[PDB]
Design a protein around this ligand. Structure first.
Ligand code: HEM
Ligand code: CA
Ligand code: CA
Length: 306
């Protein structure tokens, strides 16, 4: 079983070293907290939180960094290297990259103003990466609600609360114009915008993402508080101001009978949202972990120990 006190004897200062690394990076890159949380999410949705996403290419297996959900999107890898090196210096061969990334995600959420809690620990590192699995398992912004639900259930998260609370990760961070172009100009081959997108916000987004414009341009997931981890994401949904299709569907999909009440509850109470987010985060962090003597304690998160 994973436990929050796993390193209290072997590396009591791990969380503090992780936090310091993020605080320092945030001064030059205010987006890093969001980026780190997403790295953890994409690690857990592919063979569990086993740091498989951190592995680079080898002649025997491809890196997950080239998956459709990671390529030209996932970022922050050098920062993870930096904190890993610091932790290795403080406590040699003790903290796994899988655990390191989990702590980094929690600390990132807290530093951004979110809830503070001690994540379960004891995960170990994978001996390979899974590109095909990443392409199959990572959800896409154009998924319908049934597909989003299918994606979460596929990795072990059956609850609507898991999906609604974790989607709250979009209370901060950036998104490329590429992923919303259809909603703005030609949704589902209608030549018209997505009707569930607020028309006033539609104009704002069209201004940021013009037709035939820079598809790589970045837009904030949360128009209310772009870099603060709070429940504003849900208030946006209630006003049809979710940025991507997968966001708005939680509130507007014909299949949202079970998700709508959750969206409202999280929009109405920060405490309700924060509690649900921590619960969902720990559940996601509990997806098929390698424990005990399974896997290893990777020294360089980019390569398997030899
Ligand atoms: C429900 C399905 C989800 C879909 C389809 C989805 C999709 C995406 C997409 C399209 C981006 C934009 C990437 C880019 O343009 O570079 C992104 C970014 C992000 N996602 Fe999600 N996401 C989902 C769930 C989650 C979850 C569960 C979390 C974490 C708890 C999360 C956290 C983030 C964060 C924080 C960013 C911003 C990262 C940055 O700015 O570097 N996402 N997501
Ligand atoms: Ca993984
Ligand atoms: Ca926010």
């Amino acid at each position: 079983q994973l436990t929050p006190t796993f390193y209290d004897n072997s590396c009591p200062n791990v969380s503090n070293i992780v936090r310091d690394t993020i605080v320092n990076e945030l001064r030059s890159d205010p987006r890093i907290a969001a980026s780190i949380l997403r790295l953890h999410f994409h690690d857990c949705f592919v063979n569990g939180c086993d740091a498989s996403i951190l592995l680079d290419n080898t002649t025997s297996f491809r890196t997950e960094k080239d998956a459709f959900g990671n390529a030209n999107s996932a970022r922050g890898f050098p920062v993870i290297d930096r904190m890993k090196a610091a932790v290795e210096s403080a406590c040699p061969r003790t903290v796994s990259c899988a655990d390191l990334l989990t702590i980094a995600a929690q600390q990132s959420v807290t530093l951004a103003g979110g809830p503070s809690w001690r994540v379960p620990l004891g995960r170990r590192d994978s001996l390979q990466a899974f590109l095909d699995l990443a392409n199959a398992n990572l959800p896409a912004p154009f998924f319908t609600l049934p597909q989003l639900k299918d994606s979460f259930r596929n990795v072990g998260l059956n609850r609507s609360s898991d999906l609604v609370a974790l989607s709250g990760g979009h209370t901060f961070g950036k998104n490329q114009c590429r992923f919303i172009m259809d909603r703005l100009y030609n949704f589902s081959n209608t030549g018209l915008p997505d009707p569930t997108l607020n028309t006033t916000y539609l104009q704002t987004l069209r201004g940021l993402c013009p037709l035939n414009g820079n598809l790589s341009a970045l837009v904030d997931f949360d128009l209310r508080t772009p870099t603060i981890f709070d429940n504003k994401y849900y208030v946006n949904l209630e006003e049809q101001k979710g940025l991507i299709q997968s966001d708005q569907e939680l509130f507007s999909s014909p299949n949202a009978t079970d998700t709508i009440p959750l969206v409202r509850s999280f929009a109405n109470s920060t405490q309700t949202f924060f509690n649900a987010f921590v619960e969902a985060m720990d559940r996601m962090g509990n997806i098929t972990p390698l424990t005990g003597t399974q896997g290893q304690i990777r020294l360089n998160c980019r390569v398997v120990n030899s």
